[PDB]
Design a protein around this ligand. Structure first.
Ligand SMILES: NC(=O)c1ccc[n+]([C@@H]2O[C@H](COP(=O)([O-])OP(=O)(O)OC[C@H]3O[C@@H](n4cnc5c(N)ncnc54)[C@H](O)[C@@H]3O)[C@@H](O)[C@H]2O)c1
Ligand SMILES: NC(=O)c1ccc[n+]([C@@H]2O[C@H](COP(=O)([O-])OP(=O)(O)OC[C@H]3O[C@@H](n4cnc5c(N)ncnc54)[C@H](O)[C@@H]3O)[C@@H](O)[C@H]2O)c1
Ligand SMILES: NC(=O)c1ccc[n+]([C@@H]2O[C@H](COP(=O)([O-])OP(=O)(O)OC[C@H]3O[C@@H](n4cnc5c(N)ncnc54)[C@H](O)[C@@H]3O)[C@@H](O)[C@H]2O)c1
Ligand SMILES: NC(=O)c1ccc[n+]([C@@H]2O[C@H](COP(=O)([O-])OP(=O)(O)OC[C@H]3O[C@@H](n4cnc5c(N)ncnc54)[C@H](O)[C@@H]3O)[C@@H](O)[C@H]2O)c1
Ligand SMILES: [Ca+2]
Ligand SMILES: [Ca+2]
Lengths: 267, 267, 267, 267
């Protein structure tokens, strides 16, 4: 229905719990054709299953740490989607972040290192600019959009978020800059700031479970959001319904970012 | 399809050019049942035509300047929508603003008066709280949402916007407060900040046309948004797709709010 | 020293605990001449003592609820400060807020009334515009500045803050508008957003003491600010040192506004 | 007077036009002892002259691109300022930014490269964290503060600012994180967002002069700020007067950041 005959490149699918899986899901449900990318061979398995679940046009390798990797990915994409009068792409989904585990443990000042910061910014922030660069002509040809996933750590302190907070502030700046750079070609650029999501994996970590729990206690809706809530918001922003929207950070966080002190917290 | 069997109260329809008409339109298109309200008898005509175009369950009077007017409106609504096991309302749309014309002419300090400010805040800002108050039980019964329309004048100066800027900052605060007050009942509260819209009427005013033109010159997409772009974004926020979103200000302004100085402006 | 021969009008002194007392204090310490205003006869006593402590040029009545009251106040001020070649005023301090007590108790939606909102906006927000209006010519003559006191409730929910949150968002909009309206005459307009202050009175209220305590627990400096911290920041903004600053909201809140979830809160 | 017997480490002095020169100046004027740092041997000359003008305790090398360079700098500083019962430092001033010239020319997407972004973030953003790290114990011992210089490009697009916009969003995130990490030791962390400054050098570049000119046209005070305005604001934030302030971005930009469309711009 809504995305009939529209084409999307989705990155960052690591598994069934990935927000990007849910994004892929929402897009497929609405009639879209997908190419999915994978960073390495060990993650390739989970991507293939997504390929299966959603009838993926193609599954292409893409390490956003490698400009060469990105270039060849977009070359491959050109051959499915860059030939004919109907050439182009309707969206690119960036759902990639990484910081060395040791950057995110305890005191920001003690834990943050020159290299970890460099890596965090490269993979989490520059990579979006990199995909914008490689996708420009295809997106331009269908006036399609770019979408990234961010987080409130950028503008508000949360413990152990650390250098990812810096990397996300950076990525949100890139949203604004790209929207200015690309809007002349009718390409929209947007971000969703997802709330903390209770996953299987995440619930594993005492400190993470704790953060999830104060979240629910602060958030107006008195819960954490689900992946599907984020996927449907993403669906919206990638859809013709969002044609008037560029440069937006859309919070899908059950209202967390708007509270200073909740009544529930007062004890 | 998307809003099949869902019920919405839409205010602020003054004519075919009204953003609220386009909102009503988007909601109907997706299968929704509408009650439309009108402030006075002279505006009633335009509302009726909307009633016609969209098969309105009902057309009820509602002056958001009168608590009594609002109460009786919601009494009337109770009789269509507050009986049965399926009782309740899926959304309320607030698309009402007013300031005395003389508040909005030239120097903010010279032009702003105690009474005009009072009127601007009452009709433009308190009225949303007022509808929240009267709608609480119906919204609560279907976990539905509230939606208002705002503008960037709240946080950024634009000439002659004046006391509406203050009134809109207020209204956006009310979005945050209501989201906190109501979220425990599963009621979402959100706002769209629309960009300047080129209408027939508006194009009439030299000073307005001028503001429209610098807008297009600043905005990344190099245009002003259409009512339908705002109606579809509203559709989204009122829909189950937006179930993870409360407290949001969603800009539908073709990216204006994100620019400081455009390259086009540099001359 | 720093404010030798400079003249300030200070409002909002209700007692020794008032932030405005501390502001007056900082200004006097640095060599400034003060006129202090009082709203009513019962508050006049505390103002007089301030007059005593700081060698006030004059003590004039000023109910910011009355345009007539404000006009005559500025007439009186004209006679001390509006004659000679050295005519004018270096600053006006607005430290006035009020909402009916019943507006600020429990559920925002249940508690907020049309009239309380109206009163909150009138006294807390419009009054600053009103003083700007009456002071324009005097400020213009010495290129002096306006300063108001706000609070984070405007942009972030805190319980029972309610309609003052709306009133403060409004007042901060007025800061931006006034800065635009008045800057052509070299008049600066700024605000301080004070953190919660532990006073004698305030510590009286269980709910207030509780809010103070979560504050200290969230704030980076692990304490609440003192009146004197706010008075010295105010001193700065009213001083020639702040000649490049207009339109600013300066947070003096020991860093509260920047935290989402503190480590101390995590239990 | 105000900073009698207080000690500051100032970085980023490149010449007499440097904002950091003006900062040094303001600090000295108020009775402070300075150590100044230099990045390389060719810049060392301008630093020495500052050493002369302000009676610098010491002039130490510090390339914020080298962790080793930073460590040894703080070792040297320890020997002047880390011995005795009065050991410690009252402030550290970070006034360092760099991006490869080619990152800042034309289309953000075309011009931005993986390496330029990496370099911009390393020198402009991580370096502040690096100084925080090395200075922690000295600052802790006198409960002193850190101060950085930023710019509105972080949150609002300006042409050719590009990857520095991203780097500055990052640096402002670091301000928030550091304020949280360090506040327990009574160390404040703040930033000034300076407006565009008309310098000799800068006026040289057609595109820069143009940006300066639209600035003056947009800014409420109808001018650009001077270095001395920034130095005095810095003086304030480094002073005991600012003891209640941490995590702040203080705009010293003559009100630019608050305008959307000026009346002067409307043509
Ligand atoms: N889960 C949450 O609580 C939450 C909340 C807000 C923001 N986010 C953001 O959502 C995004 C997606 O998170 P997620 O939970 O779906 O999984 P995630 O955190 O694993 O997202 C990162 C993804 O990028 C991939 N990736 C890592 N390095 C790569 C490289 N060099 N090249 C290519 N791909 C690489 C990973 O394999 C993974 O698929 C992230 O950017 C995250 O910051 C998540
Ligand atoms: N058009 C734009 O450029 C633009 C941009 C941003 C924001 N907005 C906002 O969008 C909203 C809708 O604007 P619009 O262009 O559709 O028309 P509008 O500006 O006429 O919206 C006001 C509506 O409220 C109604 N109304 C006024 N007083 C009332 C009262 N006392 N009781 C009940 N209803 C009353 C009016 O009749 C009208 O239908 C407004 O709040 C406006 O501030 C519009
Ligand atoms: N104390 C805090 O925790 C805190 C924190 C942030 C913001 N603030 C703001 O600081 C400002 C000063 O607060 P405060 O603690 O010094 O005392 P306050 O809250 O009593 O400030 C209000 C002052 O205005 C006066 N006033 C009230 N109605 C008036 C009228 N009609 N005309 C003239 N004057 C009138 C009052 O008598 C009083 O002096 C307020 O605006 C408050 O919102 C205070
Ligand atoms: N001038 C403006 O218009 C303006 C406006 C807003 C922000 N700012 C910010 O103010 C700060 C100071 O700018 P400025 O105009 O005084 O001069 P600048 O732009 O030259 O500031 C950079 C300084 O850092 C030094 N530096 C560069 N690489 C270094 C390294 N590897 N190690 C150590 N030092 C290094 C430079 O030599 C110079 O002294 C910058 O961070 C800039 O972004 C300036
Ligand atoms: Ca937004
Ligand atoms: Ca600020």
């Amino acid at each position: 229905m809504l995305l009939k005959g529209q084409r999307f490149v989705v990155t960052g699918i690591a598994s069934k719990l990935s927000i990007a899986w849910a994004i892929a899901e929402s897009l497929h449900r609405e009639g879209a054709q997908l190419i999915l990318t994978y960073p390495n061979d060990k993650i390739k398995k989970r991507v293939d299953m997504a390929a299966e679940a959603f009838d993926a046009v193609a599954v292409i390798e893409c390490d956003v740490g490698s400009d060469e990797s990105i270039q060849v990915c977009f070359d491959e994409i050109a051959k499915h989607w860059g030939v004919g009068d109907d050439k182009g792409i309707d969206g690119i989904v960036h759902a990639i972040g990484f910081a060395p585990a040791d950057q995110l443990d305890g005191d920001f000042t003690q834990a943050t290192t020159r290299e970890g910061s460099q890596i965090a910014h490269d993979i989490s922030s520059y990579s979006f600019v990199a995909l914008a660069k490689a996708g420009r002509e295809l997106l331009a040809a269908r006036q399609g959009s770019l979408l990234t996933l961010t987080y409130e750590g950028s503008i508000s302190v949360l413990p152990n978020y650390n250098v990812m907070g810096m990397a996300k502030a950076s990525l949100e700046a890139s949203v604004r800059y790209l929207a200015s750079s690309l809007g002349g070609e009718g390409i929209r650029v947007n971000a969703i700031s997802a709330g903390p999501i209770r996953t299987l994996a995440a619930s594993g970590i005492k400190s993470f479970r704790r953060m999830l729990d104060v979240s629910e206690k602060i958030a107006p809706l008195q819960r954490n959001v689900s992946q599907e809530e984020v996927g449907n918001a993403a669906l919206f922003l990638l859809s013709p319904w969002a044609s008037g929207i560029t440069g937006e950070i859309l919070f899908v966080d059950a209202g967390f970012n708007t509270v200073a002190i909740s009544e529930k917290i007062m004890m």
